[PDB]
């Protein structure tokens, strides 16, 4: 079973969520299934908070 | 083309024991080509 | 099964129904719409083939995180029992259970993912190659041995500095490993080495054993002497009837001829003024754009006559001449091409009422420079062009005559005492046809040809003298690929009976026993095998001997009908064989090439040592 | 399986058994008569009288001649609607229902048919296997026109596109198509049946159902054509793989171990078709051509010599110091032709026009460089002659002779070659039947002249200018300078082996697209053989160089060698000399090519890419006009 | 399926990931090993002690291999009886008992056969590979003057006929045979099997079983043999076939698009092997010729110099107006060769003779033109020379020089070419280790002589004598005039372009057949551009032509592409000299060929069966005067 | 087929009632070549 030796380093609990930047490889697929998976995993409906735009 | 491995290595290549022996039997082979006629692949 | 899968949409169904058959979609196989086409067992095994090739470099995809699923061709298929054809027709015959079918869509996505792969791969492969290029790694025949350790030594002395392998070094030895089975890596933890490769059934086929020579290359060899024989195609090349020259005719080949040189009674498209005239006169001829110029015809002069020739174009050079006369200098002058259409023969030509219509088609100006010689000066190298076409000149009348000629050109009146040269004939030039639908022999078009005519009926001048759309110099063509595909089979040596020698000894045989007109005295069965190699020697060494008048034996069209068939049959029963020589050849070169291998790779050992063992 | 089915004549069967099995005839299964055949096409009369009942032997049938026989049917059902319209094959001739599924002993021999017994082996009679060919033959017989007219039609305009996607309004196209077709297509008289074959063959026509008014692909090729398409970012696999192929094949052709042999290997392996060679001997250097002779310019006093011809008539010709001959022997069979048109040939009491030249050859034991009088000459023979033809030239008061065409064939085996001190010479001088003065003609011989040879034989090979029945192609490598090889005959072993590898430098041409000082798979063989010379000891000056200086200069040599391939038998050649070198790049290609997988370079699938963008503009652009100028309503 | 055998690590049920897999050995399957194997050829030995007893891996066979391993015994089975007379192969290899089918996980990697457990998969060892392959060897090589004396046999008389039927008497033909095969023909050692062989290959010879009395065919490849048949009215399919796949070959090497584009391409990219060329410097125009320079004439004050070689021996030169050198920039690596047969070089003060030629080399900073002193030479050195003989020649009291040829090989590496301004010249000379007397010499140089010249690259291309990185072909079309074409350098991208189009070219002769003014798939595109282009608005005035004028132009146009390639690039040509109907016709051709179903042309189809009759008439006469003599007991 | 001899126990060649009669739907083949790439054979 190849894994790498090491030990895992310890952190605090961060208390707000965190921006992330995604990065794409060479896999394709179609936009069906896309709709469809995010249809199901999908988190709406919601009321949020609109704040303030001026 | 060196080499260094931690704590284990399954294989070691500036290690002993491998062998170097090319033979006509052998040979070495990938996949140049293959027949995709239109008429044939239908 | 192949075409499209059909579902009946009424009950009466036989082999000839009116309607009674429709595509079947993808709502039916238990939204848009797609068709559906059947998949082959051929199409499958092939991309299941090109899946493989991708997977032989799992280890480094797995480093670079590419493609962490495998196509998995078949996954894409769905089974369905119905009619199965190109045409309904044919589908309602042709009833189906368990085909595979699939759209377009998802064709094209696999196809895809596969390129993207290969894309990904280029330069793992490259720099794979070049370690395998780097050093011998394969030896004809027998064994070589070298250590390993030698061998990654003189790698890293020697790889580029970019080459991925360096950064990726056990990858690249699993990849080389999955490839050639001489290179072995030991199990640590068993401590065993054992032979890894993925292609032995493949390899088989290209080594050598026993005595023989590689079975693949043996019948890649027949395959390609019976293509170069089906090119030729004797049926053609040796018919008895007339064979249309669209059909007969291959793509020809510029020619090279020297106007003046040239015999009257050898070129039939050549026309010249008898030299008894002894009286030149002057004409004015307008050009295109309306411009004047003046020349002169005297006897000897010596014209083209375009009426039978097929579509030409004519280039002519004037290079290393002189046409330097005590009251004329060749520097700076002008010359042309002047086509005449006239109702005279243009040997009766004697004054300027006969010339008919007259044009200057194209001019060039004259620069000299001097020569090895002293004080004698020559022509600079001149290109004057021409095209030939016989459409837009009107040949609807029956007696028009049509004739081409160069000579010197000039805006001013030309005196005949300071010039007296007959025109600029002497000078090289270059015929190139236009046309590759029609023939000619020697020297006219002809609609239809007989090609065992041909045989044994030309002479070295008719030859030379020959357009370059002559039927002859197609035939010669023709036969040259027969002349390969002999060679490219036989090893025979010198007076050696061979397969493609035979059948002219059997005619020589049954013409000898004929009776006829002449004394005939009788040769043995070894004699006529004798002549017989030597005249197939001959005609390999040299194709053009057919054609050639008075040939040895080949100027009989017998022989040659003769050859041309038995060579269809000589290839043809052929059974994955080769000559002894060849066979005996190519094992002795196969074992020295092996010893210099065996050679190189001590210098390699000796140059890099290997540690040295101290358990 | 293969072969012919067999049945056994006796009890006793083993796979050794001596006489056990016997030929399955018509009459051991009926359902194959001709009488009980499936006549759905018609083909058998239905009169009684005009059938016969004779036996009939059986063969095994392949699944590959199945699978492609079905392909050859499904050829001609691309085409059913004009089949239709012609009343042509009503029912499809469907192989399959003329085979009948027998378990018995199959295979070409009774050996091999007592080790294999097989279970429900189609079999079929050379009459129906005859009748379903002519069936197929006559049906595309039939279709010949429709054929050509709908190619026509799909190459009057553009209708494939290298990459992307094309428009152009349908009336817009068959506007044009019906203002530019020919009078008699017969898709102006059956536009419908043309309508349904486009779609068939292409997948971008697309006829809308007017009852249901939906369109759909009809195409019935989507996986040839997925396969036969540019992806993006990569070139077709069909194109890749056919390219490798052709590289293969051309190296195969080019056999290395023959080309790369450090062992003697035997002429008429070796040998290849030759070509003709062209000289002119009057300006040949004999230090450097091995087959001439020379009297010496010493003797200094002509002599007159009668000849007599195969006729039996004499001729006279003079010979002096300085005349050049042709060592006949050890140059195998031989065509020599001589030209003298050009030359001039005038003297001052010496008129060249009207006179003859001809061909004489000499039979002597005596060497040529001693004659001094007639009788040395022993037998000598007129071969050939012809008269000659003035004619004036460009320079003013000459006139040069016409062009000739004297040709001779030299055939050692007519000769009689017993005698091992014996001396055979050719030689071509004018030739006439009055003695000639010597003070008048002054010309030593007419060979100031253009002489074309051709080999008579594709046995045989010379080396330097004498034949050697045994050949060590790797020796050839950097011994001939260019004159030598200029002077060299038309059969000598340097030709063939330029040709030979020729071949080699087209397939490594093929693969390879390389630029100015780039290593390659190709390239780096002799890099390998140049790094370990480096090293090995020797006498000199040592120089060191590193791995990129070494790359470099074995990319030059490569690139030197595709240039020009005579460069690895010219002398002194920079790196092409070395016969390690050179054996090296002969093993390395072979190796280079096996071990490509479907991969094409980086230069060449971008560019390629590139100029398919670029051809499917223009494709926009003219269909742009077209629509423009044929308006639709 | 392919690949090799896996198999679960320990315990089973559990395969979820790729580590929980193993490649199998033959330990696993006991049966696979050598000692299990069926030893019915005796290749393996009987002795227990020279057997070894070691693991082995294990591989897939596909049904492709299978195929064609099992086929391959087919030749060895036609010849059996020879076989057997020779005590070879008793038994039959049976390619099928060597397999061994099992249940297992098939693939390449461990990630791959995770996915793909298939049932029934034959596996095998290499060592049994070999074994089998190496039985199949010997038995060729034992079978091979077999062979060679059955073929002589076969082909000594006519044994097929290319249509129809024809008849003999079997016992005049025995008699033929007996009185022409060779005597050391292993025929005449067993007749009686090679009539089997022969019965065995042609359905046309039939032996009559003497205690039955009957007699009927035994060939065993009528399937083969009916697609090589011709029906009645139609060429064979093996013909059509191998023709239509040639001509798609052709199009595939001639590369459409590449020789199409529009874009730039690059040079290594669009460069083919190129081939030498000749010229003669004195002759040429400079205008024309870009890569030449002249001392202009009127300078009229000729200089002396002085040049030391490599070794360093002096020598000395005279420079005066009209000499000429070469501008050694921007024209890639090459080679020049250079021979002065047949010239003269001679004056009064002057004899060639004995005297030496040689070429030198100028780098300097000041342009030749200018060049008045002899401080402005810059460097220079002589890098080769010769010494020259002189023959008399056919003109009166004239003497030409023998046959040289002088080499020199630029390649622009080891010149330093670091300074922007620098300039470098080549000069062939007359070079004397003494002074030379200016009024003894007038000539300005030697180059009045013969000029090979040959690429020593292949990733370089020039236009007009100047080297670019890439090329556009679409703008080469209709750009160059004869004397541009002339004057241009071997390695022009002219000259690639013509060789590239030449496949196409043969590629339409193969595949069409059309008369003149006949319109072809292939001229129709030429047609609709023709069309469009004249219904375009433009400026000039517009002649409306009807559609059949329109074919007649384009068949004429596509008709003198296929007779002269040269036409495409030639300035004002016809119709070819279009960029637009070049890329028409270049496109159309692949869809014309891809588009052909298994058909061919009328006319060539008539010609066809016509020859057929007319060789099935000639060899029934050579039948009958056989049968004439040799006549019949 | 066989030149001469004198056996004639099974089939006799220079005996009577044997057919020579060559056509082109007979023809006459062998294994001249197969397919044998190294990509299709894997």
């Given at each position: 079973?190849?894994?790498?030796?090491?030990?895992?380093?310890?952190?605090?609990?961060?208390?707000?969520?965190?921006?992330?930047?995604?990065?794409?490889?060479?896999?394709?697929?179609?936009?069906?299934?896309?709709?469809?998976?995010?249809?199901?995993?999908?988190?709406?409906?919601?009321?949020?908070?609109?704040?303030?735009?001026? | 083309?060196?080499?260094?491995?931690?704590?284990?290595?399954?294989?070691?290549?500036?290690?002993?024991?491998?062998?170097?022996?090319?033979?006509?039997?052998?040979?070495?082979?990938?996949?140049?080509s293959?027949?995709?006629?239109?008429?044939?692949?239908? | 099964?192949?075409?499209?899968?059909?579902?009946?949409?009424?009950?009466?169904?036989?082999?000839?129904?009116?309607?009674?058959?429709?595509?079947?979609?993808?709502?039916?196989?238990?939204?848009?719409?797609?068709?559906?086409?059947?998949?082959?067992?051929?199409?499958?095994?092939?991309?299941?083939?090109?899946?493989?090739?991708?997977?032989?470099?799992?280890?480094?995809?797995?480093?670079?995180?590419?493609?962490?699923?495998?196509?998995?061709?078949?996954?894409?298929?769905?089974?369905?029992?119905?009619?199965?054809?190109?045409?309904?027709?044919?589908?309602?015959?042709?009833?189906?259970?368990?085909?595979?079918?699939?759209?377009?869509?998802?064709?094209?996505?696999?196809?895809?993912?596969?390129?993207?792969?290969?894309?990904?791969?280029?330069?793992?492969?490259?720099?794979?190659?070049?370690?395998?290029?780097?050093?011998?790694?394969?030896?004809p025949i027998?064994?070589?041995?070298?250590?390993?350790?030698?061998?990654?030594?003189?790698?890293?002395?020697?790889?580029?500095?970019?080459?991925?392998?360096?950064?990726?070094?056990?990858?690249?030895?699993?990849?080389?490993?999955?490839?050639?089975?001489?290179?072995?890596?030991?199990?640590?933890?068993?401590?065993?080495?054992?032979?890894?490769?993925?292609?032995?059934?493949?390899?088989?086929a290209l080594?050598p054993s026993a005595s023989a020579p590689p079975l693949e290359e043996k019948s890649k060899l027949t395959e390609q002497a019976m293509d170069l024989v089906t090119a030729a195609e004797p049926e053609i090349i040796a018919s008895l009837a007339p064979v249309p020259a669209p059909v007969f005719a291959i793509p020809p080949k510029p020619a090279?001829?020297?106007?003046?040189?040239?015999?009257?009674?050898?070129?039939?498209?050549?026309?010249?003024?008898?030299?008894?005239?002894?009286?030149?006169?002057?004409?004015?001829?307008?050009?295109?754009?309306?411009?004047?110029?003046?020349?002169?015809?005297?006897?000897?002069?010596?014209?083209?006559?375009?009426?039978?020739?097929?579509?030409?174009?004519?280039?002519?050079?004037?290079?290393?001449?002189?046409?330097?006369?005590?009251?004329?200098?060749?520097?700076?002058?002008?010359?042309?091409?002047?086509?005449?259409?006239?109702?005279?023969?243009?040997?009766?030509?004697?004054?300027?009422?006969?010339?008919?219509?007259?044009?200057?088609?194209?001019?060039?100006?004259?620069?000299?420079?001097?020569?090895?010689?002293?004080?004698?000066?020559?022509?600079?190298?001149?290109?004057?062009?021409?095209?030939?076409?016989?459409?837009?000149?009107?040949?609807?009348?029956?007696?028009?005559?049509?004739?081409?000629?160069?000579?010197?050109?000039?805006?001013?009146?030309?005196?005949?005492?300071?010039?007296?040269?007959?025109?600029?004939?002497?000078?090289?030039?270059?015929?190139?046809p236009?046309?590759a639908?029609?023939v000619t022999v020697?020297?006219?078009?002809?609609?239809?040809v007989v090609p065992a005519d041909l045989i044994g009926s030309y002479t070295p001048?008719s030859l030379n003298?020959s357009?370059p759309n002559d039927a002859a110099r197609c035939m010669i063509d023709r036969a040259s690929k027969i002349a390969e595909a002999i060679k490219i089979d036989d090893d025979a040596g010198p007076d050696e009976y061979s397969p493609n020698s035979v059948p002219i000894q059997g005619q020589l045989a049954i013409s000898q026993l004929e009776?006829?007109?002449?004394?005939?005295?009788?040769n043995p069965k070894g004699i006529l095998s004798k002549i017989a190699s030597r005249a197939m020697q001959a005609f390999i060494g040299d194709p053009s001997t057919i054609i050639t008048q008075a040939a040895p034996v080949l100027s009989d069209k017998n022989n040659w009908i003769a050859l041309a068939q038995g060579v269809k049959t000589s290839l043809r029963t052929k059974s994955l064989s080769a000559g002894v020589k060849t066979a005996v050849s190519k094992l002795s070169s196969s074992?020295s090439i092996?010893?210099?291998?065996?050679?190189?790779?001590?210098?390699?050992?000796?140059?890099?040592?290997?540690?040295?063992?101290?358990?």
């Amino acid at each position: 079973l190849g894994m790498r030796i090491s030990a895992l380093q310890s952190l605090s609990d961060t208390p707000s969520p965190v921006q992330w930047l995604p990065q794409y490889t060479i896999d394709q697929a179609a936009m069906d299934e896309g709709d469809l998976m995010v249809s199901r995993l999908t988190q709406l409906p919601l009321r949020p908070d609109y704040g303030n735009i001026w | 083309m060196g080499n260094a491995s931690s704590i284990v290595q399954t294989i070691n290549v500036t290690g002993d024991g491998n062998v170097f022996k090319p033979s006509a039997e052998t040979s070495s082979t990938a996949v140049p080509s293959l027949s995709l006629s239109p008429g044939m692949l239908n | 099964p192949g075409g499209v899968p059909w579902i009946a949409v009424g009950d009466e169904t036989s082999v000839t129904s009116p309607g009674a058959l429709r595509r079947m979609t993808s709502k039916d196989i238990p939204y848009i719409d797609e068709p559906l086409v059947v998949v082959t067992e051929h199409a499958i095994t092939n991309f299941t083939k090109a899946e493989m090739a991708l997977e032989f470099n799992r280890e480094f995809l797995d480093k670079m995180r590419v493609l962490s699923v495998s196509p998995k061709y078949s996954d894409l298929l769905t089974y369905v029992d119905c009619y199965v054809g190109v045409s309904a027709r044919q589908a309602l015959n042709n009833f189906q259970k368990q085909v595979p079918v699939i759209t377009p869509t998802r064709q094209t996505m696999y196809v895809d993912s596969i390129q993207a792969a290969l894309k990904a791969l280029e330069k793992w492969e490259i720099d794979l190659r070049v370690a395998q290029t780097l050093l011998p790694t394969n030896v004809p025949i027998g064994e070589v041995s070298c250590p390993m350790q030698s061998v990654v030594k003189l790698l890293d002395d020697q790889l580029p500095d970019d080459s991925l392998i360096r950064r990726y070094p056990k990858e690249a030895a699993v990849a080389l490993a999955k490839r050639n089975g001489g290179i072995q890596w030991m199990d640590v933890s068993e401590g065993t080495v054992m032979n890894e490769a993925v292609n032995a059934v493949a390899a088989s086929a290209l080594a050598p054993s026993a005595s023989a020579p590689p079975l693949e290359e043996k019948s890649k060899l027949t395959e390609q002497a019976m293509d170069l024989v089906t090119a030729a195609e004797p049926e053609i090349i040796a018919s008895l009837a007339p064979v249309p020259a669209p059909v007969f005719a291959i793509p020809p080949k510029p020619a090279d001829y020297n106007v003046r040189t040239l015999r009257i009674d050898e070129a039939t498209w050549l026309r010249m003024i008898p030299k008894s005239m002894n009286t030149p006169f002057q004409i004015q001829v307008t050009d295109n754009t309306g411009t004047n110029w003046h020349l002169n015809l005297r006897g000897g002069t010596r014209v083209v006559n375009l009426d039978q020739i097929a579509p030409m174009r004519f280039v002519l050079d004037l290079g290393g001449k002189s046409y330097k006369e005590t009251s004329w200098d060749p520097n700076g002058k002008k010359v042309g091409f002047i086509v005449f259409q006239s109702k005279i023969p243009f040997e009766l030509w004697t004054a300027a009422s006969q010339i008919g219509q007259a044009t200057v088609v194209n001019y060039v100006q004259l620069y000299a420079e001097d020569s090895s010689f002293t004080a004698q000066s020559i022509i600079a190298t001149t290109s004057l062009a021409y095209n030939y076409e016989p459409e837009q000149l009107n040949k609807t009348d029956p007696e028009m005559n049509y004739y081409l000629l160069a000579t010197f050109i000039d805006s001013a009146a030309i005196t005949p005492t300071n010039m007296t040269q007959p025109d600029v004939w002497d000078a090289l030039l270059t015929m190139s046809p236009l046309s590759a639908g029609e023939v000619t022999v020697k020297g006219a078009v002809v609609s239809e040809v007989v090609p065992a005519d041909l045989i044994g009926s030309y002479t070295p001048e008719s030859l030379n003298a020959s357009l370059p759309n002559d039927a002859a110099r197609c035939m010669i063509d023709r036969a040259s690929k027969i002349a390969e595909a002999i060679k490219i089979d036989d090893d025979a040596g010198p007076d050696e009976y061979s397969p493609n020698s035979v059948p002219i000894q059997g005619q020589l045989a049954i013409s000898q026993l004929e009776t006829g007109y002449g004394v005939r005295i009788f040769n043995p069965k070894g004699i006529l095998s004798k002549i017989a190699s030597r005249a197939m020697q001959a005609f390999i060494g040299d194709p053009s001997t057919i054609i050639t008048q008075a040939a040895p034996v080949l100027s009989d069209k017998n022989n040659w009908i003769a050859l041309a068939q038995g060579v269809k049959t000589s290839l043809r029963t052929k059974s994955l064989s080769a000559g002894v020589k060849t066979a005996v050849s190519k094992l002795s070169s196969s074992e020295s090439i092996q010893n210099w291998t065996q050679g190189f790779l001590d210098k390699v050992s000796a140059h890099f040592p290997a540690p040295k063992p101290d358990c």
